[PDB]
């Protein structure tokens, strides 16, 4: 079924186009444990994040083939879909690098 291929700590954000500001995903400020899940049977991937403190799901988005993953900084990465821009503010450079690596692995399978 769903296999986690990476676990990283990051604050999930979404971009507020109008106010030109990033806002906490799910409106819940704080860090989340973010996984990239590989659905073995369907061979599809998705990013899922839950708040570290209360486990609330803040992000659950598919990773489509061709996705352009941008590593804005050493600790902030982002990507988008037709509706919004997602951003991950990692708890550390190590968290960012490992997540980026897993994303590239997922994209290698998709592309």
């Amino acid at each position: 079924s769903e296999q986690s291929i990476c676990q990283a700590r990051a604050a999930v954000m979404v971009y507020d186009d109008a106010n030109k500001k990033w806002v906490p995903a799910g409106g819940s400020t704080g860090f989340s444990r973010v996984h990239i899940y590989h659905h073995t049977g369907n061979n599809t991937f998705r990013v899922v994040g839950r708040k570290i403190q209360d486990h609330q799901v803040v992000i659950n988005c598919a990773i489509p083939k061709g996705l352009k993953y941008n590593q804005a900084t050493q600790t902030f990465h982002q990507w988008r879909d037709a509706r919004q821009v997602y951003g991950l503010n990692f708890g550390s450079k190590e968290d960012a690098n490992v997540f980026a690596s897993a994303m590239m692995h997922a994209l290698e399978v998709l592309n």
Binding site: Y15, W22, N70, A72, T73, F76, Q78, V85, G87
Partner: peptide, 5 residues
């Protein structure tokens, strides 16, 4: 993409 935080 928009600028980071």
């Amino acid at each position: 993409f928009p600028p980071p935080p």
